DNA sequence: CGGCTTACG
DNA sequence: CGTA
DNA sequence: GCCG
């Protein structure tokens, strides 16, 4: 099928090298502002992840969605020579390496990285010498960059969840913490830990996240956070280690229980899976999907879901467990 | 050709 | 602009 | 860059 939400995509697969190469080109397209080419290369990479066996000859790409002349030539050169000249040229270019380094900083997007690049900046130390150019968020990202470049491990995640649950249970007894993001899809490591928080009584979650953050702050666990009312927090946590501690990015989201299936579906991802599912919803079904609900514009009504299963059924899609949403 | 991702901080 |  |  043409959309990633119509097929299972496991975490590990049989075309790792080919998909990695196409994702380099996708990433390079994004650094140059070409969102359309980024999407096509990401989609072609995702198709290969969904295949049941390795691609060994060009003919296997026949009829595969999102493979045209450019992506097929990339695959062809990898099959024939083990390397793609275009991909290798991107890898070693100063532009790619610096945009990759800069955009990996928490608080730095493509627009900011591109301005710094054009101004001649190239390294983290270059940015550190110009702290007048940095927001407080970027200063935090730069200071903690080395720890944040270390993958979070599944072992780390359970220790963090207990701490978050402790603060959440004091902020509002009966509130729950659900692991979402990449670790919910089965990843053994990640760039951060994502949590979704709710309470079984509609309305009780109002105003919860400031109370949660206050309690985490008082426990001494918050190295950075954005802080009147808010429902999403992007922070840097102090995580325990043997004889020391390390900084870890943690995302917290609060949703009312009525919206929990939609929020769980959205924040579980993958990011490409979510965009493809929303695109499918809008273009094939005429329904508008987000992390709050599923809207029929013609009837001006919202579909009530009690589960992610509900949502897949309402879109006419076979259910995909989180481990099969690794588009 | 137009379309390509979303709401919140 | 950033979360990304 | 590719789809419809
Ligand atoms: N609508 C929407 N959702 C998004 C977007 N980006 C991410 N999400 C949703 C879907 C994502 O699954 C979720 C969390 O995003 P991360 O924590 O940045 N990534 P993950 O946990 O997959 O991996 P790792 O942390 O190891 O890099 O947020 C976006 O641009 N749009
Ligand atoms: K960034
Ligand atoms: Mg994550
Ligand atoms: Mg996250």
Residue numbers in the entry: 139 to 365, 383 to 397, 410 to 494
Publication passage describing the model:
Pol μ is capable of performing gap-filling repair synthesis in the nonhomologous end joining (NHEJ) pathway. Compared with replicative DNA polymerase, Pol μ lacks proofreading activity, with an intrinsically high error rate of 10−3–10−5 for dNTP incorporation. Here, crystal structures and kinetics of Pol μ substituting dGTP for dATP on gapped DNA substrates containing templating T were determined and compared.
To further investigate the possible roles of these two residues in dGTP misincorporation, crystal structures of Q441A single-mutant and Q441A/K438A double-mutant proteins complexed with 1-nt gapped DNA and dGMPNPP were determined (Complexes 4 and 5, respectively). While the templating T exhibited a further shift to an alternative conformation, dGMPNPP and the flipped 3ʹ-end dA of the primer strand in Complex 5 adopt a single conformation, similar to that observed in Complex 4. Notably, the Q441A/K438A double mutant displays a remarkably high misincorporation rate of dGTP vs. dATP (80.4 × 10−2). Given that wobble T:dGMPNPP was observed in the structure of the double mutant (Complex 5), these two residues in the major and minor grooves appear to interact with the templating base and fine-tune the active site microenvironments of the incoming nucleotide binding.
